[PDB]
Amino acid sequence: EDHLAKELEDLNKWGLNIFNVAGYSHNRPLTCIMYAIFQERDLLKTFRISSDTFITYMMTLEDHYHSDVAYHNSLHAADVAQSTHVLLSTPALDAVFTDLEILAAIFAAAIHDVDHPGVSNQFLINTNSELALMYNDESVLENHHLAVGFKLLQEEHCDIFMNLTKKQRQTLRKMVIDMVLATDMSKHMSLLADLKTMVETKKVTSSGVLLLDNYTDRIQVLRNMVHCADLSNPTKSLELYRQWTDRIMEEFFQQGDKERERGMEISPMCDKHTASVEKSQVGFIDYIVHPLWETWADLVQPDAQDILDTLEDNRNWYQSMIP
Ligand SMILES: COc1ccc([C@@H]2CNC(=O)C2)cc1OC1CCCC1
Ligand SMILES: [Mg+2]
Ligand SMILES: [Zn+2]
User: Fold this and answer.
1) What is the sign, positive or negative, of the torsion defined by CA atoms of 12, 246, 181, 67?
2) Ligand 2 center from residue 132 Cα (angstroms)
3) Residues 182 and 227 sit within 8 Å (Cβ to Cβ)
4) Which atom belonging to ligand 1 lies closest to the Cα atom of 244?
5) CA 90, CA 303: separation in Å to the nearest integer?
6) Cβ proximity of 269 and 280 under 8 Å
7) How far apart are CA 133 and CA 129, in angstroms?
8) H or E stretch including 230?
9) 109, 110, 173, 208: most buried by Cβ count inside 10 Å?
């Protein structure tokens, strides 16, 4: 409505507020945002994607995200897709990516947690879920979100890539698989270490813009971009970040409840009788988020300085919340 258009003014901005846009779109954040993103970047015009076909695909996809799961619902995909959309425009990455790589990264963000059940890879493996057997324990969740998302492009009324070259559907299907698999947290370190090596040997043009050789380097930056977008809640305005903290702790504690119901051992950050929400967020910033964004900032400097500042600041709020 009228509040929707006022909010979508901030589309291309880190301050954008995803809750507000969920409330104004009949609980369809992901469809509203993805649709605004394509228009903005002119993707439908570029890849002859019909608008009907696009809405039908998104709506279906949004509706495969479970709405009774506290954190991994359509809101989070919408968030990660909007965050990625901004990082893609960061000044240090200007004119570096092809249209196809841009469409790949945002699409990756959109389908990247689809059909998530609200339990970890570790849980699903220890309970012998169908999914763990299906996937032999390797990026269980991630391989699944990728299969669902690419299955839904089977219908004609949903094949939004129907007007790419064969070579383009392949080059894309490859980039997406690579980016979603990289959001599996057990790959975090390898990715961070790989990022640090890329910064070490960074090269720019005379105008402070990165020089990325060919495929290998371009997709490593995209890998890392969607992984920062996935771990961007603490770089967002305090009000937004605490609402994200509440939802993730909700989801985590429902998992701790199911673990206990079943005599299994409870993972301490999922234990609702001993885990401080506050200590845990500080830890999450000190050992995972800051190390990553610090490295990202070095790569696109000084574009992410504001982001680093917001982060240290949000850090100290949570620190000051602990006795
Ligand atoms: C807003 O914070 C968080 C945001 C996102 C996630 C991802 C989804 N699940 C993950 O393991 C990473 C975890 C968070 O916090 C958890 C780390 C321990 C405290 C809660
Ligand atoms: Mg995920
Ligand atoms: Zn995610």
Assistant:
1) negative
2) 15
3) yes
4) 1
5) 7
6) yes
7) 7
8) helix 215-230
9) 109
In angstroms and rounded to an integer, the radius of gyration of the C-alpha atoms of the chain is 19
Residue 221: both structure tokens together: 């930056």
Resolution in A for the shown PDB structure? 2.4
Q: Per the omega criterion (within 30 degrees of 0), is the bond before 302 cis?
A: yes
Q: Is 72 a catalytic residue?
A: yes
Q: Residue 110: which of 86, 144, 138, 84 has the closest Cα?
A: 84
Count: domains in the chain: 1
- Which residues are 195's β-sheet partners? none
Query: Helix or strand or coil: residue 73?
Result: coil
* 67 neighbors 73 (Cβ within 8 angstroms): yes
- Choose, from 64, 72, 85, 290, the residue flagged as catalytic: 72
Instruction: Tell me the residue range of the domain where 67 lies.
Output: 1-323
Ion ligand 2 — residues with CB < 5 Å: 113, 183
Report which of 84, 77, 83 is spatially closest to residue 63, judged by C-alpha positions. Answer: 77
Per the structure block, which two tokens stand in for 44?
């439908």
Contact (Cβ atoms closer than 8 angstroms) between residue 43 and residue 103? yes
Atom number of ligand 1 nearest to Cα 245: 1
Residue type, 168: Q
Pairwise CA distance, residues 214 & 173, whole Å: 18
One-letter amino acid at 4 equals: L
Contacts of residues 127-132 at CB distance under 8 Å and 24 or more positions apart, as own/partner, are: 127/262, 127/264
DSSP 247: H
Minimum CA distance residue for ligand 1 atom 1: 245
Domain holding 123: CATH number? Answer: 1.10.1300.10
- Please tell me the total number of residues recorded for the chain in this structure: 323
Contact 87, 39 (CB under 8 A): no
Q: How far apart are the first and last CA of the chain?
A: 44
Pocket of ligand 1 (CB under 6 A): 185, 233, 244-245, 248, 252, 269, 280-281, 284
